[PDB]
Amino acid sequence: NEVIKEFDETVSQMDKAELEERWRLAQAFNATLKPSEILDPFTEVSEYANMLKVHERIGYVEIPAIDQEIPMYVGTSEDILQKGAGLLEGASLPVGGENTHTVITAHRGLPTAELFSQLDKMKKGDIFYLHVLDQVLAYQVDQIVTVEPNDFEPVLIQHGEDYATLLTCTPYMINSHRLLVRGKRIPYTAPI
């Protein structure tokens, strides 16, 4: 909020050639990422996403269906999950691209930040935006499933496609299962 304002303000002061080289470095990481075993963030050395870091924030996720703009951070440690959404370890960077699947995790509400509390309100067709460096990527929801903390392939990188999954715990205030809201990239570029 204050954080989101500070983020966009810093980005607008950054050099264009440098904004572009960073983007390309993240795309290079996405093009080479091997499939690995993705663990539940809510249970149990990294240069991961360095090119995207702006005072430790890698951007924010914007979800008009639930009136949220939540800062994103690297990893899903509790330090992070207390203050915003975390990018899941082993998944794509949120810079999109063919054969990518980024995964953004937040608690189902904290006492003073709703975060992903209202994620059950999202429906197929809903559009959310990843704001990353000076870019904004639109994703349109095409699948919503609830799974056991051991059930986790709907976050599989599917060849050809560009996906982003918003991930939280469910039922509300019980948190025994995981709610996955998957969106697929649609054409959108931020206005100038």
From TrEMBL:
<dbReference type="GO" id="GO:0016787">
    <property type="term" value="F:hydrolase activity"/>
</dbReference>
<feature type="active site" description="Proton donor/acceptor">
    <location>
        <position position="107"/>
    </location>
</feature>
<keyword id="KW-0812">Transmembrane</keyword>
<keyword id="KW-0378">Hydrolase</keyword>
<keyword id="KW-0472">Membrane</keyword>
<feature type="active site" description="Acyl-thioester intermediate">
    <location>
        <position position="169"/>
    </location>
</feature>
<protein>
    <submittedName>
        <fullName>Sortase</fullName>
    </submittedName>
</protein>
<keyword id="KW-1133">Transmembrane helix</keyword>
